[PDB]
Amino acid sequence: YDPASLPDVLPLYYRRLFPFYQYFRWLNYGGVVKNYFQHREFSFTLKDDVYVRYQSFNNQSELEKEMQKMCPYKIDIGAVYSHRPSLHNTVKSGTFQAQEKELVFDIDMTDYDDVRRCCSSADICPKCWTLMTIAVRILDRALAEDFGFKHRLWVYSGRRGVHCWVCDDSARKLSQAERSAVAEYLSVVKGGEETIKKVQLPETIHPFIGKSLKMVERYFEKYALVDQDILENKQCWDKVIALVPEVARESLLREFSKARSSVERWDKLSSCLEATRRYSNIPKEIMLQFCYPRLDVNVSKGLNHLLKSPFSVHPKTGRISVPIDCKKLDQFDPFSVPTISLICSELDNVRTRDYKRTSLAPYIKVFEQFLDKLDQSRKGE
């Protein structure tokens, strides 16, 4: 993909591929609340990194128009305000307030850098994507069981991670404090680059942590012991040794000198820890420190946060921010995600059904199913 080719393709996509009808269905939420779509904030990033916010639109036609006119490189969705953002200058000071917004989570592979060995920075590979695969299951289950949020849209971020939009009416009316509470409840791996032991579970395992460890276990052997090989050599297993009390460290080292496979080393570590009881949760702390999602509480706490819009185009990879089907999560491949160049090649190879002829169709289908569920909830209620 040639990023110099981005300015050539962006218009066509925004003209014949961007799913505006479903997009308006989403952000309009069945028209129940008046001025809901009209008070939504958008922000655009144009060529040469020119940023504009407090953009609002009257209806789908105005949005389609101004978007096709601007051809933005980035589209971010923001809060629904007390008035129309376009007229925020006209609103008396203090009377312009963000009132409702989806509850959103951003999981970014870059935040896992201190604990992955295959890639670094913005590089991803099939060996590390399983971490995202774990996160979506660990988090989404909580959101479906502990909090009872029923309408959850998971979206690929385009490069390094995934976003989650929780759109239940209750989740859209949550205050800042309630959002911060939700984020802290879901958050376990606490600390920066200056801390080595980032998980310190108490004697009692809270049911949520038990279910997160249960989800982790299913994948741990493949991710950590086979793929990541977190015990390949001394430079790496020294870390895991650094994560357990010194008392057994020596006892482990000799054992790790006689083990040929990291699965064997894990068995040995588990046996040694079991023999050594307050430390019976130490293996769980290691698993969490290598597998549990990291959440930027600043992303989810603030109501006025602008997050990458679904079906955006990644300025560098060119991939489309496509929704991820929860059931088919295990089959999701971030490298097969349609790029803008591929879908423009597909478009120029054959009115409201043009996208069905591209590789974008199944993802718009997943989005349509999610919107159908939202409509059913709006009606039934």
């Binding site: 909090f147 309630e178 409840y185 049911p207």
Partner: protein
């Protein structure tokens, strides 16, 4: 159910929600009112003297309830006529006392307290069966989580609440609250969340019941105070209700004495002028008020003294509360910056505002 009974009084305990509709006699009215006043005064005295969980408290309260013939124990026999009578007593007397104890906030609080105490005692005497019956008749629908759902999430609840033992947990009942209200609990992950509801722990159930009761009762008292003009016109019931609370069933005066000996000459002069003219200019007011605060005159005592002294100066009684009450409160650090202003020091008095004529 002899002659004119019904299902109007199912259970002994009640929330006193529905006012009585009967036509009773004046003698019955007075007897019921006085009897419940005796019961509530006994409750208050026993609460002051003993710990409400003490066995002495229970024994004495049972003795009083038996002496005044109020419902306190259940009976797994049926609704016997005598029992019905007792319950009727309780129901009418309560509302009569409401009419007596809604005029002033103080009174209201007192009433509420006594009623709550009595209710707690009675709940403490309810067998589990009876307890459930009560919880059903009032649509409280506590199985508050059910027992079956509690067993359903037994392990989750056990791991949720810190330091909760298996059997002790079996002895406890939880409540279901929207998670938006348990922010401080959920945030550090010390309460289980299931389907958007937190299961918050509370022997404890009585507490919840009492909370509900108190809410209701406060509301009722407000309404009664709002419906007072209709009753004041009934002379028959005015002597009773207006005075039921007063029904048999350092001192300001010594300040003058102190002025003879202990008061320094400054305060002696100020007091002499005050008693001569029943009025002091601002400087005298400040100085004397601070001094009387220093000797120990409490805010109520100082307010009473100043009110009584100034009222004789041919000024409206309401004018005092309008003007000088704030100054008196401020001298005691009750308003404004709310500072416990110290009494003037001799250096301040000498170097304070220079007195002039008058």
């Amino acid at each position: 159910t002899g002659d004119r009974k019904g299902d109007l009084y199912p259970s002994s305990l009640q929330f006193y929600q529905h006012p009585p509709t009967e036509n009773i006699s004046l003698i019955e009215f007075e007897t019921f009112a006085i009897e419940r006043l005796k019961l509530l005064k006994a409750v208050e005295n026993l609460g002051v003297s003993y710990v409400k969980n003490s066995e002495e408290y229970s024994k004495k309260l049972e003795l009083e309830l038996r002496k005044l013939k109020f419902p306190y124990r259940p009976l797994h026999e049926e609704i016997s006529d005598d029992v019905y009578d007792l319950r009727r007593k309780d129901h009418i007397s309560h509302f009569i006392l409401r009419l007596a104890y809604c005029q002033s906030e103080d009174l209201r609080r007192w009433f509420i307290q006594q009623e709550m105490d009595l209710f707690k005692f009675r709940f403490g005497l309810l067998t589990k069966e009876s307890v459930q019956e009560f919880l059903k008749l009032n649509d409280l629908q506590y199985v508050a989580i059910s027992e079956d759902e509690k067993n359903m999430h037994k392990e989750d609840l056990m791991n949720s609440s810190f330091g909760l033992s298996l059997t002790k947990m079996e002895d406890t009942e939880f409540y279901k609250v929207p998670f938006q209200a348990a922010l401080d609990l959920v945030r550090p992950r010390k309460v289980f969340l299931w389907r958007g509801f937190a299961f918050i722990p509370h022997k404890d159930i009585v507490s919840i019941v009492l909370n509900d009761f108190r809410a209701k009762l406060s509301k009722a008292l407000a309404l009664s105070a709002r419906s007072l003009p209709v009753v004041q016109s009934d002379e028959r019931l005015q002597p009773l209700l207006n005075h039921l609370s007063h029904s048999y069933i350092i001192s300001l005066e010594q300040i003058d004495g102190f002025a003879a000996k202990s008061f320094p000459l400054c305060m002696r002069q100020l007091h002499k002028s005050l008693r001569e003219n029943h009025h002091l200019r601002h400087g005298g007011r400040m100085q004397y008020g601070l001094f009387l605060k220093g000797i120990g005159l409490t805010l109520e005592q100082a307010l009473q003294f100043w009110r009584l002294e100034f009222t004789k100066g041919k000024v409206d009684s309401e004018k005092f509360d309008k003007v000088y009450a704030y100054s008196i409160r401020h001298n005691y650090g009750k308003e404004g910056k709310r500072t416990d202003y110290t009494p003037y020091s001799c250096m301040k008095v000498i170097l304070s505002n220079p007195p002039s004529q008058g």
